Amino acid sequence: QCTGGADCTSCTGACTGCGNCPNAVTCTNSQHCVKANTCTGSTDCNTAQTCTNSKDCFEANTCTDSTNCYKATACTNSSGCP
Amino acid sequence: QCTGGADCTSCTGACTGCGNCPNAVTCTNSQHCVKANTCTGSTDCNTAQTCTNSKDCFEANTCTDSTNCYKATACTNSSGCP
């Protein structure tokens, strides 16, 4: 459901190493984590509050090694910060 | 395993929300992550290179909201930084 492979659409828990996690609350090394609240090494973390080495963290308050952190008040080696 | 529970000693990948992750290479919201390279929300991250809201990051190069970041060159709201 939540671990490995190309698609984890039904995962609402912790997604790990999976190629599509649009409903997961946490992502580690996963893709398309549009609903996650925390991301590590993951993509499209558009609503995450915390990102580490992740992409498009438009809502995060905390970003490290991450991109497009529009709201991050803690911004380390990240793009797009206020 | 790696997600949830009291004991994730068997986890050699990433822990998420687990009470004991001594062999994990990544931790999120987990305890005793003494081997983790990356920690978020986690404890005992003694060998992590990157910590976010984690504890005892004695070897991290980068810390945010973390403790005892004794050699961190990127240091945001963290204790013990050089």
Curated annotation (Swiss-Prot), chains A, B:
Key words, A-Z: Antifreeze protein, Disulfide bond, Repeat, Secreted, Signal
Disulfides per UniProt: 2-11, 8-18, 15-21, 27-33, 39-45, 51-57, 63-69, 75-81
Location in the cell: Secreted
Domain of life: Eukaryota
Membrane-crossing segments per the record: none
A GO term from the CC aspect: extracellular region
Assembly and interaction partners: Monomer.
Family to which the UniProt record says this protein belongs: Belongs to the insect antifreeze protein family.
Domain remarks in the Swiss-Prot or TrEMBL record: Forms a right-handed beta-helix that is stabilized by disulfide bonds. The building blocks of this beta-helix correspond to tandem repeats with the consensus sequence T-C-T-X-S-X-X-C-X-X-A-X.
Record's function text: Contributes to protect body fluid from freezing at subzero temperatures. Lowers the freezing point of the hemolymph by about 2.5 degrees at a concentration of 1 mg/ml. Binds to nascent ice crystals and prevents further growth.
Protein name per the record: Thermal hysteresis protein YL-1
